[PDB]
Amino acid sequence: IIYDDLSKQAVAYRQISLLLRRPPGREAFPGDVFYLHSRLLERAARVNAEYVEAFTKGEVKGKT
Amino acid sequence: AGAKDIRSKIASVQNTQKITKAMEMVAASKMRKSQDRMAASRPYAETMRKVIGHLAHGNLEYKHPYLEDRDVKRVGYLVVSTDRGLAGGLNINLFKKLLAEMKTWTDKGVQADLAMIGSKGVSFFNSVGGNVVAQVTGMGDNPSLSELIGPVKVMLQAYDEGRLDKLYIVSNKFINTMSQVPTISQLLPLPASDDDDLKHKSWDYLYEPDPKALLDTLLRRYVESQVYQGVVENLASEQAARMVAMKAATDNGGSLIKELQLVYNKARQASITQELTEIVSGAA
Amino acid sequence: TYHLDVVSAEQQMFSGLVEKIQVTGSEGELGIYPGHAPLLTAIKPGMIRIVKQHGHEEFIYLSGGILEVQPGNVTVLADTAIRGQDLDEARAMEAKRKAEEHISSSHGDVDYAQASAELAKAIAQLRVIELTKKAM
Amino acid sequence: MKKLSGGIRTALAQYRELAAFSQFASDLDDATRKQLDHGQKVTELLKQKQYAPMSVAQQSLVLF
Amino acid sequence: MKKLSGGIRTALAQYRELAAFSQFASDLDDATRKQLDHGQKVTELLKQKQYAPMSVAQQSLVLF
Amino acid sequence: QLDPLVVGQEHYDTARGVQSILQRYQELKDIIAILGMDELSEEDKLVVARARKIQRFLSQPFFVAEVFTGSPGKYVSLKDTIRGFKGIMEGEYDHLPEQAFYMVGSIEEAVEKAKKL
Amino acid sequence: QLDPLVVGQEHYDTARGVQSILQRYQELKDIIAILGMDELSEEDKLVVARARKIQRFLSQPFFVAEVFTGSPGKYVSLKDTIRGFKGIMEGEYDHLPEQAFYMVGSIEEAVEKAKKL
């Protein structure tokens, strides 16, 4: 997966935040801009075979 | 001020530090080459001085002018200077020593004449008003004996023409890579060598045509060789001084980056605080 | 054989062992074989013949110089350019003219000329000492 | 004034382009030394005392 | 690729600082002349056209 | 858009050649300042003269600027632009003076202006 | 009040010359800091020496600051200070050391303090 600009997602989040009056932080980005990208990129993971088998209820067993 | 101007200034000082490091390395290589070209000069002057010793104080001796003193009515100086700056105090220590001794001699009421090797001394002694009678300039790091023949010819011609009574070469001495010292040393009339006539009786030369004509050219070639050796030593000394001066300048730049960064951090923090306060205090 | 040197104010030109040499001495052609008695003469500009041991003839061009022969050694003190009252005087007259009319030649160092200029430009209007409150 | 002032912009422009060398001016070549010492004179020329205004004839004469 | 390429990265970092030193220095030691003239080849080798990807065989052959 | 696949190799090579000559003249300026010009090679003095000509030739008299300077305007087609610059960079005009190229519009008007200088 | 029409041409001109020297000295501090003092032109070293002498001579011992330094206070009249600064600027005290000027009254007390180092 390729995020074409996470720079212009931070800007869009700053916009949609200030319009809700939420208090800003450094460089006027919202308080939790770090959390915005953190909880996104932490989904990029390699997942071991038991998680796959448990999620997929046994339909796939050998794979990661 | 404001974080951006200071970040620009820090960029430019880092660039200055790169440049002076490069010049340090360049001078550090040219110094080794210069002190090699310095060693290749010794044999000629050493053997020619042995020959002059034989013809001067061997079992016979001659009345040649260059070998015995007379009344000092005026003095000549051959001044070696660098062609390039950024060498630190090299040139000015030398010129100050020269000026002191020229003042001594002019107190005794004897004039002095200057012949210049290198353009820095030319400009200096023009601005100070000394008597510059001949010059050669722009040799750079390719000194060649064929370009020194001019000024030393002038000074020798004026010596045997009776218009000079003593002749000096003023130049730096590449003692060691960390230390160079300006020296004013006499080369006419000829210094009394650490030699003994006792060894001479073993043999003598078949002079063709005759010794009185040979001794003249020997002494002229010897003086030329010593001016050339002084020039090459001054060049090696220049390279060493530029190396150490650029070392000092690179450390001075590095120690200034760390002040500018304190200023920059303080301004960064100040701008964040002011902006965020102007937002939060405008709401409601 | 004997040990020959040909040297100049600037650099050496030959060293090694030789059988004979032939030199156009100032007063006449001349040839040195081993054991030659001590001798001292000027030489004219021109070639000299070395025959290195095993007989490898060679030629070198000398612009002048002085020849010294000794019991064992012989050394030729060459010089780097033609010499004489005719030419040294032209050199001296130019050396005077350039001091009378203040003619300064540029050095040849392009490397220094570049580094000096980059340093001058980088160090310009830097105003750093106003900015950090360094007393000075 | 339009005719004469056109040379002052260029004098001072070349001066601003060479001004960085003023501190190493001794090593400079005599070709650029003349521009560097011309810019200084046309700069020293533009100095003026207070309450002493110049008619256009005087300004044109001096800039000429 | 791990075997044939472990050296490239530091070679290029050092080449790119050396090639900066070289602008002020003519008269280069031949041992560093070798280093510059090699780093320059390899830098010239790594540039590539836009839409032309290479399979690992074609990359490994070139790096060899 | 400045890449060969769109502007052709002719235009692209002319543009990059001009940028390279001007970039080299930037280097040589600071040697000319210190060592004087005669310390330049015979080839480098050629880069200098051609960079100065190229730098004059980029200027142009506009039709709307006539009110500022009285000079009539000139419209220069792209063929003339590429042809003129590509000629200058190849030594075709090494015999004209620099000022022949200043505010001259098309290249054929530089040869006309050189006759009058 | 610093106008020629208010303080006279000589007072005004001395003050402007002092500002000029100290400003030229500020401009040199960055090159002095990077490259050291030996790269200065032979007349910029003189500017630096006179600027430091002027910086010292601007100092004065106050009568209310005896408690801090012991040294007794001094009163310097205007006629007596423009003379001293005109002297330092014109070069007629270049032979004294810097410390000869620190914390003195008029210029005569500096000329004296130099005897005692």
mmCIF file of N, CA and C in Angstrom, chain B residues 6 9 12-13 15-16 19-20 23 30 40-41 44 47-48 51 55 83-86 126 132-135 137-138 140-141 143-146 149-151 153-154 157 203-209 214 217-218 221 224 228 242 256 259-260 263, chain C residues 7-12 27 36-42 66 68-71 75 77-81 83 85 88-89 91-92 95-96 98-99 102-109 111-112 115-116 118-119 122-123 125-129 131-132:
data_model
loop_
_atom_site.group_PDB
_atom_site.id
_atom_site.type_symbol
_atom_site.label_atom_id
_atom_site.label_comp_id
_atom_site.label_asym_id
_atom_site.label_seq_id
_atom_site.Cartn_x
_atom_site.Cartn_y
_atom_site.Cartn_z
ATOM 1 N N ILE B 6 18.549 32.312 11.163
ATOM 2 C CA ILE B 6 19.629 31.661 11.882
ATOM 3 C C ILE B 6 19.925 30.307 11.267
ATOM 4 N N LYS B 9 22.170 31.068 8.430
ATOM 5 C CA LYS B 9 23.527 31.382 8.862
ATOM 6 C C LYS B 9 24.272 30.129 9.292
ATOM 7 N N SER B 12 25.548 28.420 6.325
ATOM 8 C CA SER B 12 26.710 29.026 5.692
ATOM 9 C C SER B 12 27.968 28.814 6.513
ATOM 10 N N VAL B 13 27.852 28.737 7.836
ATOM 11 C CA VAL B 13 29.052 28.466 8.618
ATOM 12 C C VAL B 13 29.488 27.019 8.456
ATOM 13 N N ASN B 15 29.202 25.403 5.728
ATOM 14 C CA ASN B 15 29.889 25.438 4.443
ATOM 15 C C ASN B 15 31.300 25.999 4.584
ATOM 16 N N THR B 16 31.453 27.089 5.333
ATOM 17 C CA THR B 16 32.788 27.623 5.573
ATOM 18 C C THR B 16 33.694 26.570 6.187
ATOM 19 N N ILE B 19 34.973 24.251 3.572
ATOM 20 C CA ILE B 19 35.996 24.837 2.717
ATOM 21 C C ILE B 19 37.341 24.836 3.422
ATOM 22 N N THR B 20 37.371 25.278 4.677
ATOM 23 C CA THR B 20 38.660 25.352 5.345
ATOM 24 C C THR B 20 39.229 23.975 5.640
ATOM 25 N N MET B 23 40.979 23.123 2.361
ATOM 26 C CA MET B 23 42.240 23.833 2.196
ATOM 27 C C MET B 23 43.305 23.290 3.133
ATOM 28 N N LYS B 30 50.670 19.651 -0.373
ATOM 29 C CA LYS B 30 51.669 20.514 -0.988
ATOM 30 C C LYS B 30 52.860 20.726 -0.069
ATOM 31 N N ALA B 40 65.942 18.016 -2.584
ATOM 32 C CA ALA B 40 66.642 17.853 -3.848
ATOM 33 C C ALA B 40 67.589 19.004 -4.145
ATOM 34 N N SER B 41 67.594 20.048 -3.326
ATOM 35 C CA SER B 41 68.435 21.206 -3.578
ATOM 36 C C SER B 41 69.791 21.133 -2.896
ATOM 37 N N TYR B 44 73.875 20.281 -4.732
ATOM 38 C CA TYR B 44 74.540 21.293 -5.538
ATOM 39 C C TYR B 44 75.238 22.314 -4.655
ATOM 40 N N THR B 47 78.305 20.710 -2.528
ATOM 41 C CA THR B 47 79.554 20.472 -3.237
ATOM 42 C C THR B 47 80.156 21.771 -3.746
ATOM 43 N N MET B 48 79.328 22.732 -4.149
ATOM 44 C CA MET B 48 79.897 23.992 -4.591
ATOM 45 C C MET B 48 80.522 24.744 -3.434
ATOM 46 N N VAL B 51 83.949 23.269 -2.941
ATOM 47 C CA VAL B 51 84.885 23.801 -3.927
ATOM 48 C C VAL B 51 85.298 25.221 -3.565
ATOM 49 N N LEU B 55 89.149 26.722 -2.932
ATOM 50 C CA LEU B 55 89.766 27.855 -3.613
ATOM 51 C C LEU B 55 89.960 29.063 -2.709
ATOM 52 N N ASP B 83 53.208 34.386 -2.074
ATOM 53 C CA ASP B 83 52.375 34.965 -3.110
ATOM 54 C C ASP B 83 50.898 34.898 -2.771
ATOM 55 N N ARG B 84 50.544 34.273 -1.655
ATOM 56 C CA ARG B 84 49.167 33.962 -1.331
ATOM 57 C C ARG B 84 48.943 34.209 0.151
ATOM 58 N N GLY B 85 47.722 34.574 0.499
ATOM 59 C CA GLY B 85 47.363 34.858 1.871
ATOM 60 C C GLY B 85 46.974 33.608 2.625
ATOM 61 N N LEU B 86 46.189 33.805 3.677
ATOM 62 C CA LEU B 86 45.687 32.719 4.510
ATOM 63 C C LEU B 86 46.804 31.889 5.115
ATOM 64 N N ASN B 126 55.794 48.617 -0.653
ATOM 65 C CA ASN B 126 55.333 49.824 -1.323
ATOM 66 C C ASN B 126 54.491 50.675 -0.385
ATOM 67 N N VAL B 132 62.435 49.679 -2.830
ATOM 68 C CA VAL B 132 62.409 48.440 -3.591
ATOM 69 C C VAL B 132 63.039 48.714 -4.944
ATOM 70 N N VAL B 133 64.172 48.070 -5.215
ATOM 71 C CA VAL B 133 64.935 48.347 -6.424
ATOM 72 C C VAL B 133 64.677 47.341 -7.539
ATOM 73 N N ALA B 134 64.300 46.108 -7.212
ATOM 74 C CA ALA B 134 63.997 45.100 -8.215
ATOM 75 C C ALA B 134 63.004 44.124 -7.613
ATOM 76 N N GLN B 135 62.355 43.346 -8.472
ATOM 77 C CA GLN B 135 61.370 42.407 -7.965
ATOM 78 C C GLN B 135 61.103 41.312 -8.980
ATOM 79 N N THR B 137 57.813 38.212 -9.206
ATOM 80 C CA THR B 137 56.546 37.904 -8.573
ATOM 81 C C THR B 137 55.822 36.832 -9.365
ATOM 82 N N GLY B 138 54.859 36.198 -8.708
ATOM 83 C CA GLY B 138 54.002 35.254 -9.390
ATOM 84 C C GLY B 138 54.643 33.927 -9.692
ATOM 85 N N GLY B 140 54.441 31.414 -7.543
ATOM 86 C CA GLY B 140 53.531 30.420 -7.011
ATOM 87 C C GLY B 140 54.304 29.264 -6.431
ATOM 88 N N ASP B 141 53.847 28.051 -6.727
ATOM 89 C CA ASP B 141 54.499 26.839 -6.262
ATOM 90 C C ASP B 141 55.331 26.183 -7.351
ATOM 91 N N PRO B 143 58.627 27.570 -8.253
ATOM 92 C CA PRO B 143 59.832 28.391 -8.257
ATOM 93 C C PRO B 143 60.883 27.768 -9.152
ATOM 94 N N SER B 144 61.608 28.621 -9.863
ATOM 95 C CA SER B 144 62.620 28.155 -10.789
ATOM 96 C C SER B 144 63.795 29.104 -10.719
ATOM 97 N N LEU B 145 64.997 28.542 -10.777
ATOM 98 C CA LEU B 145 66.178 29.375 -10.625
ATOM 99 C C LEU B 145 66.287 30.401 -11.738
ATOM 100 N N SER B 146 65.738 30.109 -12.911
ATOM 101 C CA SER B 146 65.889 31.032 -14.023
ATOM 102 C C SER B 146 65.164 32.343 -13.790
ATOM 103 N N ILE B 149 67.395 34.861 -11.361
ATOM 104 C CA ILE B 149 68.631 35.440 -11.864
ATOM 105 C C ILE B 149 68.533 36.952 -11.948
ATOM 106 N N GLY B 150 67.356 37.483 -12.237
ATOM 107 C CA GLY B 150 67.202 38.906 -12.387
ATOM 108 C C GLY B 150 67.585 39.670 -11.139
ATOM 109 N N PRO B 151 66.775 39.555 -10.091
ATOM 110 C CA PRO B 151 67.046 40.334 -8.878
ATOM 111 C C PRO B 151 68.404 40.068 -8.265
ATOM 112 N N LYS B 153 71.022 39.199 -9.864
ATOM 113 C CA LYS B 153 71.960 39.877 -10.747
ATOM 114 C C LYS B 153 72.023 41.357 -10.422
ATOM 115 N N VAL B 154 70.871 41.981 -10.192
ATOM 116 C CA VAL B 154 70.865 43.388 -9.808
ATOM 117 C C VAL B 154 71.686 43.591 -8.546
ATOM 118 N N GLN B 157 75.531 42.889 -9.139
ATOM 119 C CA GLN B 157 76.068 43.981 -9.931
ATOM 120 C C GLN B 157 76.271 45.213 -9.069
ATOM 121 N N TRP B 203 95.799 17.265 -2.325
ATOM 122 C CA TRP B 203 95.862 17.454 -3.797
ATOM 123 C C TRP B 203 95.411 18.856 -4.189
ATOM 124 N N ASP B 204 95.602 19.229 -5.457
ATOM 125 C CA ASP B 204 95.142 20.498 -5.998
ATOM 126 C C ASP B 204 94.656 20.298 -7.430
ATOM 127 N N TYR B 205 93.909 21.279 -7.926
ATOM 128 C CA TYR B 205 93.254 21.176 -9.222
ATOM 129 C C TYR B 205 94.159 21.593 -10.372
ATOM 130 N N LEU B 206 93.872 21.046 -11.547
ATOM 131 C CA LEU B 206 94.326 21.608 -12.815
ATOM 132 C C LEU B 206 93.310 22.637 -13.279
ATOM 133 N N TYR B 207 93.541 23.907 -12.977
ATOM 134 C CA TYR B 207 92.573 24.932 -13.338
ATOM 135 C C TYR B 207 92.643 25.242 -14.822
ATOM 136 N N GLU B 208 91.510 25.133 -15.503
ATOM 137 C CA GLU B 208 91.390 25.546 -16.891
ATOM 138 C C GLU B 208 90.294 26.591 -17.009
ATOM 139 N N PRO B 209 90.594 27.836 -17.393
ATOM 140 C CA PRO B 209 91.920 28.331 -17.764
ATOM 141 C C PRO B 209 92.801 28.669 -16.571
ATOM 142 N N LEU B 214 87.595 31.212 -12.589
ATOM 143 C CA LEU B 214 86.623 30.234 -12.122
ATOM 144 C C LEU B 214 85.978 30.669 -10.818
ATOM 145 N N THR B 217 82.785 32.909 -11.083
ATOM 146 C CA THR B 217 81.524 32.277 -11.432
ATOM 147 C C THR B 217 81.083 31.318 -10.347
ATOM 148 N N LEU B 218 82.022 30.691 -9.642
ATOM 149 C CA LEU B 218 81.614 29.827 -8.546
ATOM 150 C C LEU B 218 80.858 30.617 -7.495
ATOM 151 N N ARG B 221 77.347 31.659 -8.810
ATOM 152 C CA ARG B 221 76.418 30.546 -8.836
ATOM 153 C C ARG B 221 76.045 30.126 -7.429
ATOM 154 N N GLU B 224 73.424 32.547 -6.091
ATOM 155 C CA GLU B 224 72.149 32.224 -6.719
ATOM 156 C C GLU B 224 71.534 30.986 -6.091
ATOM 157 N N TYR B 228 67.882 30.630 -4.132
ATOM 158 C CA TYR B 228 66.889 29.641 -4.526
ATOM 159 C C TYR B 228 66.510 28.740 -3.360
ATOM 160 N N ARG B 242 49.898 27.609 6.344
ATOM 161 C CA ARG B 242 48.518 27.582 5.884
ATOM 162 C C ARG B 242 47.795 26.368 6.434
ATOM 163 N N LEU B 256 31.597 27.819 16.761
ATOM 164 C CA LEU B 256 30.593 28.851 16.548
ATOM 165 C C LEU B 256 29.267 28.280 16.088
ATOM 166 N N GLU B 259 27.252 27.870 19.161
ATOM 167 C CA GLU B 259 26.586 29.044 19.698
ATOM 168 C C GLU B 259 25.352 29.377 18.883
ATOM 169 N N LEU B 260 25.499 29.343 17.563
ATOM 170 C CA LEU B 260 24.362 29.649 16.715
ATOM 171 C C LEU B 260 23.226 28.673 16.958
ATOM 172 N N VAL B 263 21.212 29.825 19.899
ATOM 173 C CA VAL B 263 20.339 30.922 19.490
ATOM 174 C C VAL B 263 19.149 30.386 18.710
ATOM 175 N N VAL C 7 74.206 17.278 -11.460
ATOM 176 C CA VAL C 7 73.229 17.900 -10.583
ATOM 177 C C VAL C 7 73.054 19.353 -10.982
ATOM 178 N N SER C 8 71.952 19.936 -10.528
ATOM 179 C CA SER C 8 71.631 21.322 -10.810
ATOM 180 C C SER C 8 71.114 21.973 -9.543
ATOM 181 N N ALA C 9 70.936 23.288 -9.601
ATOM 182 C CA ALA C 9 70.403 23.985 -8.442
ATOM 183 C C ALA C 9 69.070 23.404 -8.022
ATOM 184 N N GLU C 10 68.288 22.930 -8.982
ATOM 185 C CA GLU C 10 66.925 22.488 -8.745
ATOM 186 C C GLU C 10 66.844 20.999 -8.447
ATOM 187 N N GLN C 11 67.370 20.170 -9.341
ATOM 188 C CA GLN C 11 67.161 18.737 -9.263
ATOM 189 C C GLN C 11 68.393 18.012 -9.768
ATOM 190 N N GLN C 12 68.494 16.747 -9.391
ATOM 191 C CA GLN C 12 69.539 15.880 -9.897
ATOM 192 C C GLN C 12 69.190 15.419 -11.305
ATOM 193 N N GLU C 27 87.578 25.351 -22.523
ATOM 194 C CA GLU C 27 88.790 25.633 -23.272
ATOM 195 C C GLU C 27 89.081 24.588 -24.332
ATOM 196 N N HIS C 36 91.465 9.914 -13.351
ATOM 197 C CA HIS C 36 91.895 11.216 -13.839
ATOM 198 C C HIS C 36 92.302 12.111 -12.679
ATOM 199 N N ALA C 37 93.371 12.872 -12.875
ATOM 200 C CA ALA C 37 93.856 13.750 -11.829
ATOM 201 C C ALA C 37 92.834 14.847 -11.549
ATOM 202 N N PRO C 38 92.915 15.482 -10.384
ATOM 203 C CA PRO C 38 91.943 16.526 -10.054
ATOM 204 C C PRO C 38 91.941 17.624 -11.099
ATOM 205 N N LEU C 39 90.751 18.116 -11.421
ATOM 206 C CA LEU C 39 90.617 19.139 -12.443
ATOM 207 C C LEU C 39 89.338 19.916 -12.198
ATOM 208 N N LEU C 40 89.313 21.149 -12.689
ATOM 209 C CA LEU C 40 88.175 22.034 -12.490
ATOM 210 C C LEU C 40 88.067 22.956 -13.686
ATOM 211 N N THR C 41 86.949 22.889 -14.397
ATOM 212 C CA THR C 41 86.771 23.694 -15.590
ATOM 213 C C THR C 41 85.298 23.994 -15.794
ATOM 214 N N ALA C 42 85.031 25.121 -16.438
ATOM 215 C CA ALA C 42 83.709 25.378 -16.971
ATOM 216 C C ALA C 42 83.496 24.551 -18.228
ATOM 217 N N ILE C 66 79.747 23.693 -14.473
ATOM 218 C CA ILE C 66 81.131 23.589 -14.040
ATOM 219 C C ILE C 66 81.447 22.126 -13.804
ATOM 220 N N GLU C 68 83.949 19.410 -11.984
ATOM 221 C CA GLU C 68 84.943 19.131 -10.964
ATOM 222 C C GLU C 68 85.292 17.656 -10.999
ATOM 223 N N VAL C 69 86.572 17.354 -11.157
ATOM 224 C CA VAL C 69 87.068 15.986 -11.137
ATOM 225 C C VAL C 69 87.924 15.810 -9.897
ATOM 226 N N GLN C 70 87.754 14.689 -9.231
ATOM 227 C CA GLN C 70 88.460 14.412 -7.992
ATOM 228 C C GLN C 70 89.076 13.025 -8.071
ATOM 229 N N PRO C 71 89.796 12.581 -7.043
ATOM 230 C CA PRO C 71 90.381 11.240 -7.104
ATOM 231 C C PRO C 71 89.356 10.191 -7.494
ATOM 232 N N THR C 75 81.738 15.314 -10.585
ATOM 233 C CA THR C 75 80.405 15.881 -10.513
ATOM 234 C C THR C 75 80.299 17.040 -11.478
ATOM 235 N N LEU C 77 78.161 20.291 -12.305
ATOM 236 C CA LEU C 77 77.196 21.234 -11.751
ATOM 237 C C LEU C 77 76.543 21.960 -12.912
ATOM 238 N N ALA C 78 75.542 21.327 -13.506
ATOM 239 C CA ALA C 78 74.826 21.967 -14.591
ATOM 240 C C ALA C 78 74.027 23.146 -14.063
ATOM 241 N N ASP C 79 73.554 23.977 -14.984
ATOM 242 C CA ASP C 79 72.616 25.032 -14.646
ATOM 243 C C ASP C 79 71.468 24.986 -15.637
ATOM 244 N N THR C 80 70.348 25.581 -15.239
ATOM 245 C CA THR C 80 69.069 25.304 -15.872
ATOM 246 C C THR C 80 68.788 26.165 -17.094
ATOM 247 N N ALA C 81 69.566 27.213 -17.334
ATOM 248 C CA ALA C 81 69.325 28.058 -18.490
ATOM 249 C C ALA C 81 70.643 28.626 -18.975
ATOM 250 N N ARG C 83 73.565 30.919 -19.719
ATOM 251 C CA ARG C 83 74.077 31.978 -18.868
ATOM 252 C C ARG C 83 75.111 32.794 -19.622
ATOM 253 N N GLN C 85 76.779 37.254 -19.689
ATOM 254 C CA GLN C 85 76.547 38.676 -19.487
ATOM 255 C C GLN C 85 75.562 39.244 -20.492
ATOM 256 N N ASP C 88 71.809 37.478 -18.837
ATOM 257 C CA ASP C 88 71.566 37.862 -17.457
ATOM 258 C C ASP C 88 71.289 39.346 -17.334
ATOM 259 N N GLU C 89 71.858 40.162 -18.217
ATOM 260 C CA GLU C 89 71.586 41.589 -18.150
ATOM 261 C C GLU C 89 70.181 41.909 -18.628
ATOM 262 N N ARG C 91 67.652 39.888 -18.298
ATOM 263 C CA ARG C 91 66.842 39.483 -17.154
ATOM 264 C C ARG C 91 66.857 40.558 -16.078
ATOM 265 N N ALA C 92 68.032 41.118 -15.788
ATOM 266 C CA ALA C 92 68.125 42.113 -14.728
ATOM 267 C C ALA C 92 67.384 43.387 -15.101
ATOM 268 N N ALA C 95 63.834 42.819 -14.495
ATOM 269 C CA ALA C 95 63.579 42.836 -13.065
ATOM 270 C C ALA C 95 63.563 44.248 -12.515
ATOM 271 N N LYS C 96 64.304 45.164 -13.127
ATOM 272 C CA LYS C 96 64.211 46.554 -12.703
ATOM 273 C C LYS C 96 62.927 47.190 -13.207
ATOM 274 N N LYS C 98 60.107 46.033 -13.817
ATOM 275 C CA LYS C 98 58.918 45.614 -13.088
ATOM 276 C C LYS C 98 58.852 46.203 -11.688
ATOM 277 N N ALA C 99 59.947 46.757 -11.178
ATOM 278 C CA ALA C 99 59.897 47.462 -9.906
ATOM 279 C C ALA C 99 59.693 48.949 -10.095
ATOM 280 N N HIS C 102 54.978 49.292 -11.498
ATOM 281 C CA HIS C 102 54.663 48.251 -10.524
ATOM 282 C C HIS C 102 53.816 47.160 -11.179
ATOM 283 N N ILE C 103 54.511 46.295 -11.913
ATOM 284 C CA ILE C 103 53.893 45.180 -12.623
ATOM 285 C C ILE C 103 53.902 43.957 -11.710
ATOM 286 N N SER C 104 52.723 43.523 -11.273
ATOM 287 C CA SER C 104 52.582 42.305 -10.486
ATOM 288 C C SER C 104 51.890 41.230 -11.312
ATOM 289 N N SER C 105 52.573 40.108 -11.508
ATOM 290 C CA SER C 105 51.959 38.959 -12.153
ATOM 291 C C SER C 105 51.082 38.198 -11.166
ATOM 292 N N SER C 106 50.040 37.558 -11.684
ATOM 293 C CA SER C 106 49.261 36.651 -10.860
ATOM 294 C C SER C 106 50.026 35.356 -10.648
ATOM 295 N N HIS C 107 49.863 34.771 -9.469
ATOM 296 C CA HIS C 107 50.348 33.419 -9.276
ATOM 297 C C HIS C 107 49.522 32.482 -10.147
ATOM 298 N N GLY C 108 49.913 31.220 -10.189
ATOM 299 C CA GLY C 108 49.236 30.270 -11.040
ATOM 300 C C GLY C 108 48.231 29.391 -10.350
ATOM 301 N N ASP C 109 48.042 29.554 -9.046
ATOM 302 C CA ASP C 109 47.338 28.571 -8.228
ATOM 303 C C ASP C 109 45.841 28.750 -8.408
ATOM 304 N N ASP C 111 43.655 26.402 -7.686
ATOM 305 C CA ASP C 111 42.977 25.772 -6.563
ATOM 306 C C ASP C 111 42.787 26.763 -5.431
ATOM 307 N N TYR C 112 43.869 27.422 -5.033
ATOM 308 C CA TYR C 112 43.767 28.452 -4.015
ATOM 309 C C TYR C 112 42.857 29.580 -4.468
ATOM 310 N N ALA C 115 39.292 28.294 -3.812
ATOM 311 C CA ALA C 115 38.937 28.139 -2.410
ATOM 312 C C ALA C 115 38.845 29.490 -1.723
ATOM 313 N N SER C 116 39.775 30.392 -2.027
ATOM 314 C CA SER C 116 39.738 31.719 -1.436
ATOM 315 C C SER C 116 38.445 32.435 -1.772
ATOM 316 N N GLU C 118 35.450 31.045 -2.660
ATOM 317 C CA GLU C 118 34.311 30.448 -1.977
ATOM 318 C C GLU C 118 34.306 30.842 -0.512
ATOM 319 N N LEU C 119 35.483 30.928 0.098
ATOM 320 C CA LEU C 119 35.552 31.337 1.490
ATOM 321 C C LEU C 119 35.145 32.791 1.661
ATOM 322 N N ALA C 122 31.278 32.875 1.286
ATOM 323 C CA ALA C 122 30.568 32.282 2.410
ATOM 324 C C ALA C 122 30.677 33.152 3.650
ATOM 325 N N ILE C 123 31.826 33.801 3.851
ATOM 326 C CA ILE C 123 32.047 34.556 5.081
ATOM 327 C C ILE C 123 31.442 35.948 5.046
ATOM 328 N N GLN C 125 28.819 39.183 5.015
ATOM 329 C CA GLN C 125 27.594 39.673 5.661
ATOM 330 C C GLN C 125 26.989 38.630 6.589
ATOM 331 N N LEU C 126 27.858 37.878 7.249
ATOM 332 C CA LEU C 126 27.442 36.776 8.100
ATOM 333 C C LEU C 126 26.827 37.274 9.406
ATOM 334 N N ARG C 127 27.287 38.419 9.913
ATOM 335 C CA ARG C 127 26.715 39.085 11.088
ATOM 336 C C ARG C 127 26.555 38.159 12.284
ATOM 337 N N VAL C 128 27.323 37.078 12.364
ATOM 338 C CA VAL C 128 27.099 36.122 13.440
ATOM 339 C C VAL C 128 27.387 36.733 14.802
ATOM 340 N N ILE C 129 28.404 37.592 14.905
ATOM 341 C CA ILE C 129 28.802 38.091 16.221
ATOM 342 C C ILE C 129 27.839 39.117 16.792
ATOM 343 N N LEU C 131 24.749 38.328 16.683
ATOM 344 C CA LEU C 131 23.564 37.501 16.857
ATOM 345 C C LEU C 131 23.693 36.612 18.085
ATOM 346 N N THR C 132 24.720 35.780 18.126
ATOM 347 C CA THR C 132 25.173 35.263 19.402
ATOM 348 C C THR C 132 25.814 36.402 20.174
#
